[PDB]
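To close the section, here is one more complete example, presented without commentary so you can practise reading it yourself. The ligand is U0I.
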Amino acid sequence: RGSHMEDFVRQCFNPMIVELAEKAMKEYGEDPKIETNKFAAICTHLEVCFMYSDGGSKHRFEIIEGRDRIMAWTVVNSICNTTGVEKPKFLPDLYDYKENRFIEIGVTRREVHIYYLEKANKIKSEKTHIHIFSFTGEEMATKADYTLDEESRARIKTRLFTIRQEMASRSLWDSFRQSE
Ligand SMILES: COc1cc(CCNC(=O)c2nc(Cc3ccccc3C(F)(F)F)[nH]c(=O)c2O)ccc1O
Ligand SMILES: [Mn+2]
Ligand SMILES: [Mn+2]
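Output:
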């Protein structure tokens, strides 16, 4: 109770995003008021996913991240049962209607190389595209296919470095970087 991080998080992110992160955490046992670095990470992840879907066309993406567990899986099965793609082992973040694949978004506080390797080994189902973002500005996509145009990805990187800065200016950055 009474952490600087928790007050910064609800100040940095959109209320609807904070609410979705809150609900997503409690659904999986975590508590936003003690596990505040996770709380911070979940909002960043959520916002990155939303900006990602904001790239490209209006019908381009179907957002899986943000929905509750059961409806998310329901949309996945509908997407698999209509497009023929194989159902993924873990819940993905997006489905690309133009490129006919699921997308797994990553936000990491280490060199993009390791995190990609870990998530590429977490699913091992292939097909499911992986797109990794770092807080420094590095990105990382399967087959070097970065899906969106450069300007849409540059927006995401810019926002990620703004979050890093606001955290450091309040001295929460170092603890946040170590929590992963
Ligand atoms: C409560 O926490 C969250 C739960 C959800 C619903 C399903 N979880 C993901 O979809 C997801 N989880 C993570 C990190 C994480 C966090 C908790 C458990 C497991 C994992 C993972 F094993 F995946 F590493 N990183 C993503 O990129 C990612 O898409 C979404 C965002 C969250 O913040
Ligand atoms: Mn996800
Ligand atoms: Mn993800």
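Once you have examined the tokens, check your reading against these statements. Residues 45, 93, 104-106 surround manganese (II) ion (ligand 3) (CB under 6 Å). The helical segments are 4-12, 15-27, 36-54, 69-83, 112-123, 150-169, 173-179.
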